[PDB]
């Protein structure tokens, strides 16, 4: 009698590629045709923030587009004005090994994590006047590599024991579980409006995730290898999602397909991080290569490069105003770009 | 074993009740979209140096 | 020979400009060692700008045409120059011998700040030994004809006093070059048991570029300071020509350091961009 | 939308000394840039290295036990790979997978072993006996 | 205020230094073979940073890549290790780190453990490794066992290199190990710095 589920599985699996084939009317390539070139993106350093003694492993900016947090191995949060390149916060670590580190949309806390398993929440504001641990998040199984606040009392993790969480920061505790991947997530992006969020993982698959009922709505595959860095597009309609098969693709929710392929014969190196511009048609890459690419989102032809670093570039960030750049790198500074 | 079996069909029964809408619609979407707030793009659109905090203040 | 001579000019010139341009435009290059590196190129840079040319003007004139004052000042310059030249090279030397004797307190021992005021130190020495002695007439010797080369503008000269003969060249040359033996033979001691702990090829290639460095510097430079500690107990052995001869060699020193101690993948990398 | 797959096929019953040809098709990615294996589960074990090709065909590595015995071989053009086994011994009796190397255009392949690793085919079964 | 910006920003630029005073002289390294567990040791005034990643998943490619700059990674091995086949799969997982990218220019310092174990079972291992019918050593039988098991490791070893890193093999009594870590670390700096002058 286990055929039963077998011939379900069949039918439902037969009738979704079905749907999908029947939705494929043009490709992104037609409907853009007409449209303009980007042009030749040729940005520049304004700034190098120098100080951390280690790679760097992750940056996040602050909705205020000046103040920026990095973390690298060497244990230290570093929290920067980028207008004048001063240290606002240099802020010890317990646990040397940090992949990820998170700036809350309030300003008042940060948060970081690492191979500690560990989602540590630090406050800034202080009667006493010096930067404390306000929380440990404890309950994962393997390494925290992303984290987002969704406001001063809830952040969302993944972790490599292949689940995400959200948490409840007054209380410690671990309010949704979301299980369905079978890889190592290596990182989530929210959707503006923090209903949604999605998450990319070891198995070459991207799962779209409800905040509230905690469930699975979506999965995407098309990747040939691991997905290392996922980033909203700026109207939550689409994503795109960075590969070790030296690829990038952007895949629509509502079409339920992928859109677009960004790759190119002499790029054979692996996309470590991705982000776009504040209008969604810049798409940016960092590598292995040591270099950023830029591409077209729209036309998938490369735009641009930032050659500015002799190691690994592990991080980017876009300015919620968009007026800046961040990358970090292996090399162990922080550049910003213009 | 057919737990599992059972997962997996309402997985599925998930990722097969969605309303789908049209490439062509996703593109135009996407388009529109990017060709709308290009205005408000500084990497894209370069910035007098004048009002561009990591040049001159 | 006006000829040869600007090609040593060219040579010397362009070569310490790549190398200060590479370790100046390169991220990678900008090491703690290459401040060392620097140093040294920048003394061969001005050996090859101001020191040479005014030497090959008078070996082709022989006669001075630019007064006594600027005698006194290129006579300073040379020497200054090349003391910073040899002390910048045994100080390369003592920088490897802390890296490989104490490999992990080296991290500690050697900061940026040290650095900066070991080179510090180093053209201080060199000050101390060309301009002020040169420049007060410490120097100058009692003798006749000594005088009447010091009483004529087309005279300009180097005939000094033994005392100072001999302090300028100890200090310039001998203890410098007896720290390079002492730290290059450990070097290649430490470098024969690393080699044995690991398998003759590579003892050959250690042996190489260890010869290379020591030979050429002594091979440059040690018959004219040799011949200018003898000009002084005795002074009818080595005539004149000899001696400018291994002057110019010393000065040909300058053009080698470049291939000596930046031939490393970054720098080749950097000249071939550069270029 | 476009998946990893790989699909063995070939396992079945045989006597001991016999011989089977086990192939596996793969779809998704492009054959010719990865290197691939043939791991093994026997009942009651974990899962055994048993065989790698890399890319082109030219370097091929075996587990000593089958060194002799067992052929690799990669039809880049058919996206095909293939394990000829000769003289079977009752110790070959497993369910026997293709597994991918995770990236491509690399020589280091990590986790082809582990329990639950994505690249990998359902299986076959060899059951060597009388 | 941009004075006590300035100000702030000079207090934590002294920390800072005295930050990288401390930690350009201690060593990190990699044991291998709640996330994280540390253990900090010194010798002979060196101090040394030996992290031991239990608490993770078994799926390895992604955090391993964390230790691209320790000073070591220190690989143990059950040598004589329904028994499964452990020496290959040891042997697979060295070369996969020795070949990987972010990892090439690091050394392995390989400890070879259960030597007792091994010395009461050659008395099992020609089923697999059948060239250990063949090789000869560089009782006798464990001697053989022995070295023919670093020979494998040795190989994978000598066969990608090409200068940048080495492996430092031992047969393991906690003090001596230590110092064999200690020597080795010493013998891998000295050997990086020999390089970079050309002399190695
Ligand atoms: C034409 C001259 C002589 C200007 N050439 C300068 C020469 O290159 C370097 O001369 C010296 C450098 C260092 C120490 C020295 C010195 C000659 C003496 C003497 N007693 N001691």
């Known amino acids: 009698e286990l055929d039963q589920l077998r011939q379900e599985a069949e039918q439902l699996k037969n009738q979704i590629r079905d749907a999908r084939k029947a939705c494929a009317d043009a490709t992104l390539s037609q ?14 350093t304004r700034r190098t923030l120098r100080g951390h003694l280690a790679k760097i492993y992750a940056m996040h900016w602050g909705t205020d587009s000046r103040l920026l947090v990095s973390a690298s191995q060497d244990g230290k949060l570093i929290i920067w004005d980028s207008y004048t390149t001063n240290k606002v916060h240099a802020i010890p670590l317990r646990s040397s090994w940090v992949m990820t580190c998170a700036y809350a949309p309030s300003g008042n806390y940060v948060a970081c994590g690492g191979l500690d398993n ?35 009392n809830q952040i969302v993790t993944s972790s ?26 290596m990182s989530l992006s929210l959707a503006p409006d923090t209903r949604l969020f999605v998450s990319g993982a070891c198995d070459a698959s991207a799962k779209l995730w409800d905040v509230r009922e905690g469930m699975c709505r979506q999965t995407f595959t098309g990747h040939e290898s691991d997905i290392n860095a996922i980033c909203f597009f700026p109207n939550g309609n689409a994503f795109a999602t960075g590969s070790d098969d030296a690829t990038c693709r952007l895949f629509d929710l509502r079409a339920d397909q992928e859109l677009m392929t960004y790759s190119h014969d002499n790029i054979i190196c692996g996309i470590t991080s991705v982000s776009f511009s504040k209008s969604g048609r810049l798409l940016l890459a960092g590598y292995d290569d040591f270099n950023c690419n830029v591409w077209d989102a729209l036309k998938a032809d490369r735009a641009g490069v930032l050659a500015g670093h002799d190691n690994r570039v592990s991080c980017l960030g876009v300015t919620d105003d968009g007026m800046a750049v961040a990358t970090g790198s292996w090399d162990s500074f922080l550049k910003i770009w213009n | 074993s057919i737990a599992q079996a059972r997962k997996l069909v309402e997985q599925l029964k998930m990722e097969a009740n969605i309303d789908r809408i049209k490439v062509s619609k996703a593109a135009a979407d996407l388009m529109a979209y990017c060709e709308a707030h290009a205005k408000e793009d500084p990497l894209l659109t370069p910035v007098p140096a004048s009002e561009n905090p990591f040049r001159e203040k | 020979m006006s000829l040869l001579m600007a090609l040593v000019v060219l040579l010397i010139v362009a070569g310490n400009v790549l190398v200060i341009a590479a370790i100046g435009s390169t991220q990678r290059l900008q090491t703690l060692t290459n401040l060392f590196i620097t140093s040294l190129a920048c003394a061969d840079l001005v050996v090859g700008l101001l020191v040479v040319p005014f030497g090959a003007t008078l070996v082709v004139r022989g006669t001075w045409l630019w007064g006594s004052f600027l005698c006194e000042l290129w006579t300073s310059l040379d020497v200054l120059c090349v003391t910073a030249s040899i002390e910048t090279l045994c100080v390369i030397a003592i920088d490897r011998y802390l890296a490989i004797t104490s490999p992990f307190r080296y991290q500690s021992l050697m900061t940026r700040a040290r650095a900066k005021v070991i080179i510090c130190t180093v053209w201080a020495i060199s000050a101390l030994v060309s301009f002020l002695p040169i420049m007060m007439h410490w120097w100058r010797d ?13 005279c300009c000269d180097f005939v000094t006093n033994r005392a100072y003969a001999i302090a300028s060249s100890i200090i310039s040359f001998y203890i410098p070059l007896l720290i390079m033996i002492f730290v290059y033979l450990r070097v290649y001691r430490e470098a024969k048991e690393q080699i044995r702990k690991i398998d003759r090829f590579r003892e050959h290639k250690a042996l190489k570029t260890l010869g290379i460095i020591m030979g050429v510097f002594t091979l440059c430079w040690l018959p004219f300071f040799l011949v200018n500690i003898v000009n002084v107990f005795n002074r009818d052995l080595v005539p004149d020509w000899l001696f400018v001869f291994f002057n110019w060699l010393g000065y040909a020193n300058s053009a080698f350091n470049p291939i000596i101690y930046c031939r490393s993948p970054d720098f080749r990398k950097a000249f071939k961009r550069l270029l | 939308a476009a998946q990893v797959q790989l699909q063995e096929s070939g396992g079945g019953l045989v006597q001991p000394g016999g011989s089977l040809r086990l192939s596996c098709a793969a779809s998704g990615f492009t054959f010719s840039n990865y290197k691939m294996n043939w791991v093994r589960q026997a009942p009651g074990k974990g899962l055994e290295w048993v065989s790698d090709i890399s890319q082109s065909g030219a370097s091929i590595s075996y587990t000593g036990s089958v060194k002799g015995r067992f052929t690799i071989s990669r039809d ?12 079977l011994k009752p110790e070959d009796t497993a369910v026997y997978y293709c597994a991918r190397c995770p990236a491509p255009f690399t020589r280091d392949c990590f986790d082809v072993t582990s329990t639950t690793y994505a690249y990998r085919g359902q299986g076959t079964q060899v059951t060597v006996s009388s | 205020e941009e004075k006590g910006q300035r100000e702030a920003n000079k207090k934590i630029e002294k920390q800072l230094q005295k930050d990288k005073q401390v930690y350009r002289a201690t060593h990190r390294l990699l044991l291998l073979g709640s996330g994280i567990f540390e ?56 070369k996969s780190i020795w070949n990987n990218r972010w990892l090439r220019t690091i050394s392995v310092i390989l400890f070879l453990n259960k030597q007792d174990l091994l010395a009461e079972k050659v008395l099992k291992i020609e089923d697999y490794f059948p060239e250990f019918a063949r090789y000869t050593t560089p009782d006798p039988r464990v001697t053989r066992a022995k070295y023919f098991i670093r020979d494998e490791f040795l190989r994978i070893s000598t066969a990608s290199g090409d200068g940048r890193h080495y492996c430092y093999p031992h047969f393991t009594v ?11 670390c010493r013998d891998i700096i000295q050997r990086m710095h020999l390089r970079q002058y050309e002399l190695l």
């Open chain 5, 39 to 94: 253990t900090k040791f010194q010798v002979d005034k060196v101090n040394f940073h030996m992290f031991d990643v239990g608490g993770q998943r078994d799926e390895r490619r992604k955090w391993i890549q964390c230790f691209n700059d320790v000073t070591a990674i220190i690989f143990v091995v059950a040598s004589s290790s329904n028994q499964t086949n452990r020496l290959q799969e040891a042997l697979n997982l060295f």
């Open chain 1, 160 to 185: 490599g024991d292949t689940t995400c969480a959200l948490w409840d920061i007054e209380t410690g505790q671990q309010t949704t579980t979301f299980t369905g991947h079978t890889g190592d997530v």
């Open chain 4, 76 to 87: 880049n053009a058919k996206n095909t790979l293939y394990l000829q086994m000769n003289s």
């Open chain 3, 142 to 154: 009692e003798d006749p004809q000594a005088l009447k080369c010091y009483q004529d503008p087309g």
């Open chain 1, 31 to 44: 409907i853009t045709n007409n449209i303009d070139p980007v042009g030749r993106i040729q940005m520049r």
């Open chain 1, 118 to 152: 560990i989602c540590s929440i630090y406050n800034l504001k202080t009667r006493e006047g010096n930067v404390r641990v306000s929380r440990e998040l404890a309950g994962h199984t393997g390494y925290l590599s992303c984290c987002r606040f969704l406001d001063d």
């Open chain 5, 174 to 184: 906690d003090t001596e190990n230590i110092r064999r870590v200690f020597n080795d």
